[PDB]
Design a protein around this ligand. Structure first.
Ligand SMILES: COc1ccc(C2(CNC(=O)c3ccc(NC(=O)c4ccco4)cc3)CCOCC2)cc1
Ligand SMILES: [Zn+2]
Lengths: 46, 162
């Protein structure tokens, strides 16, 4: 519902999988702008 | 108020956005269960999202956060994938619709790995996969992510057990 007091967001940082990058959470819609809409297919590996 | 401007494949902007998509793919611990089995994407279209009202709302908040954080918005470009993407581009993000508890609680989630955001395009855990074939690894159906400008400000550091 709310960011921790005195913070504006949460950084979720994987501590086991060293190859995994971060995720982030915000609690106010005005703190993001959807700048690019990307339309795509996943590709089957050969 | 939203217009979508199609970018051409030789536009430098098309190319830098695609490279961010492609280069941030990883393997996932579910073996592709949620989002499917792939090492790369086939980018079909990139549109720039233009809405004056949502942009002004954004920059107003950015300035507030920045003044609360030694003039540092801590602005990132990050992926968002969910079934809410069509609503989001027209209405902007809305925290009221973002009430499900994830790994880091309720709220609006973004990812550095495009492949993480790809896990959610059809729902939590990939839901039942694509609407046409019910296939979470569908290689036919078109998918959509947003590449978003996100103000983090002072971000609380949560180490996760993943
Ligand atoms: C039905 O599939 C899903 C898929 C993923 C999720 C999680 C992430 N959830 C969000 O990131 C989220 C949800 C809703 C919105 N909604 C809006 O911004 C909005 C504007 C107008 C209408 O909706 C914005 C962001 C929930 C927390 O665990 C991680 C995924 C929830 C539902
Ligand atoms: Zn399909």
């Amino acid at each position: 519902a709310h960011s921790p007091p005195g913070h504006h967001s949460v950084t979720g940082r994987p501590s086991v999988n060293g190859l995994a990058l971060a995720e982030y959470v915000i609690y106010r819609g005005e703190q993001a702008y959807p700048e690019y809409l990307i339309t795509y297919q996943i590709m089957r590996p050969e | 108020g939203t217009i979508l401007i199609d970018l051409s494949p030789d536009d430098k902007e098309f190319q830098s956005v695609e490279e961010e998509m492609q280069s941030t793919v990883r393997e996932h611990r579910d073996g592709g269960h949620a989002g499917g089995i792939f090492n790369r994407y086939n980018i079909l279209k990139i549109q720039k999202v233009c809405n004056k009202k949502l942009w002004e709302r954004y920059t107003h908040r950015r300035k507030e956060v920045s003044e609360e954080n030694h003039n540092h918005a801590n602005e990132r470009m990050l992926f968002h994938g969910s079934p809410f993407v069509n609503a989001i581009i027209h209405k902007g993000f809305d925290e009221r619709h973002a009430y499900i508890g994830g790994m880091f609680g309720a709220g609006i989630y973004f990812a550095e790995n495009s492949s993480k955001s790809n896990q959610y395009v059809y729902g939590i855990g990939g839901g039942t996969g694509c609407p046409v074939h019910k296939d979470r690894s569908c290689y036919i159906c078109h998918r959509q992510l947003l590449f978003c400008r996100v103000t983090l400000g002072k971000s609380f550091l949560q180490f996760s057990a993943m």
